[model samples]
Target: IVGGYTCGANTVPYQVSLNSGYHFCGGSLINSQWVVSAAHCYKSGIQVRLGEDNINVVEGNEQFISASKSIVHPSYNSNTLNNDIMLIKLKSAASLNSRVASISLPTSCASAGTQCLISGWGNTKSSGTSYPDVLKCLKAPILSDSSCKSAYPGQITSNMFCAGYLEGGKDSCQGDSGGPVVCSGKLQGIVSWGSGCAQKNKPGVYTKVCNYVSWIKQTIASN
Candidate 1:
């Protein structure tokens, strides 16, 4: 029932919500034809918004329909979030005009040390609180393997890539799961797990998107 959101009792760009009314964790308009979110967000009645600000009592142009189906990654594991990715085929398509935009998927990703962007309504500060109303974003450079190894000592694995402020100010927390960890403006990873909001000796873990390039391509091609 997230018709949209309200700010100061006024509605802005309306978007959809999950369960009853909650911002989606991972999602994007693929073309004018599809949306890519995460499988974990696929609760029974998950909803999406297009143009709104507040989430409870706001209103604006919405899809006017529900998702037709859910397509989760073949290797997705609800337990460890091994391949925690998904795609929602909107009952219909959205207009490609400025009101709505689709992010481009990256054919190539970043190396050891590179800059990336992460945005969400999750915590702005570690383990503290979620962004009050609107979505929040941050940028941090990837920690080189050597630096990350020094930080985590014996935990760095090739299956994962580490990125964040070495000084330790930003990270993904509770509800940030399944969100994108974009690098070089390309969708490179998905927010997967971490020890705690902000803890000692633990860095955030992400699902490496590059490792599953074939799967992504096959899914899109099949659909």
Candidate 2:
């Protein structure tokens, strides 16, 4: 996340790294064996690393698991990035502990101006070449749907909501896709896409998790 600080280790236990031979995205554990991320983040050789704080080190509490299956939303539109949500089933269930746990899903949608937290290992700067080894976190404010649509005309949809500042400064960037957007201590959104890292008039857009609760439940049940 842009303009963030190094987060305390294990503070966000549900956070996981989505690696395709390398750490390319972030995800959140919704259950012992299930992780949710952006559908567009999917790639070959994708795997999940849980209870990790630093990407370069395999900590004692860390658990790496291969993806048994990836379930992308059938209606996901990459062109417009609509319905950009996905679930990855682990080969085996994760052993939950103090440093490894699942996050709670939101019972309702986040309201405009709600303050939220986003954590990831994305680049510190938009044009930076490397990502931080340690996880970083930043606070963002949810924007009104009307204001968000004004920022990206005809781009934001019901399945998506906007967060960050219109004046610019804090936001999620590359290598942060699929990360959790926690509002009121619950998983309210998933980092999906953005115009650039912390750019003015271009707040980060996320997949509205509350809008897909039924879909998530159905996917986990059937998959």
Candidate 3:
């Protein structure tokens, strides 16, 4: 996340670095065997590393698991970026420990004024490459639906939400997609998309996780 700080070890323990030799996306371990991320991140050869703090070094708190299955929302639209959520079933359950914990799902949708935490290993700059070795986190407020609509008219939908400073600064930039947007210790949103990182009137758009809880449950059960 741009304009953020280094996350302390196990501070955001549920956060996972979705890697394939290099950090590409971020995700939340919702359970011992399942992880939630953005549908757009669906691809082959990707592995999930839980309890990761830094990508540059070997931290014993990490667990590398292969994807037994990758399930993307059936109705996910690439053009409109709707229903941009995905669940990855791990090859094996992670041993829950102090460094590897699961994040609970949000029981309710986050409101406009709700402050949320976003953590990721994404690029720190809105421009050239500046990805950090350590995970970074930013706390931003969820913007009202109307305000988000104003920022991206005809693009914002109920399935999605926006969060960040309207004046431009902190935001979910490149490489953060599919990361967790946690509020009140609940997984509220999944980092989906954004316009030019952090910019005026452009906030980070996310897949509203609360809207997909049932779908996630059903998918996991059926799979």
TM-score of each: 0.76, 0.97, 0.98
Best of the two (1, 3) by TM-score: 3
Clashes of 2: 0
| Residue-level error in angstroms, candidate 1, position 121 | 0.9
Q: CA RMSD for every model? A: 5.4, 1.0, 0.8
Using lDDT as the measure, name the better of candidate 1 and candidate 2: 2
Q: Considering TM-score, where higher is better, how would the candidates rank from best to worst?
A: 3, 2, 1
- Cα-based lDDT at residue 64, candidate 2: 94
The global Cα lDDT (0 to 1) of model 2 is 0.91
Clashes per candidate, residues 3 or more apart or on different chains: 12, 0, 0
The Cα error of candidate 2 at residue 8, in Å, is 0.7
Candidate 3's residue-wise lDDT over 1-223, tens digit each?
Answer: 8888888888998999888778889999999999999999888888999888888788778899988888989999988889999999999999999999999998888888899999999989977679898889999999999999999999988999999999998899888999999999899999999889988899999999999999998988888
* lDDT score of residue 34 within candidate 2: 96
lDDT of 2 by residue, 1-223 (tens): 8888888999999999998889989999999989999999988778899989988987788999999999889899999999999999999999999988999888989999999999999988956655899999989999999998999998999999999988887889998999999999889999998898899999999999998889989889997
Question: What value does the lDDT take at residue 68 in candidate 3?
Answer: 89
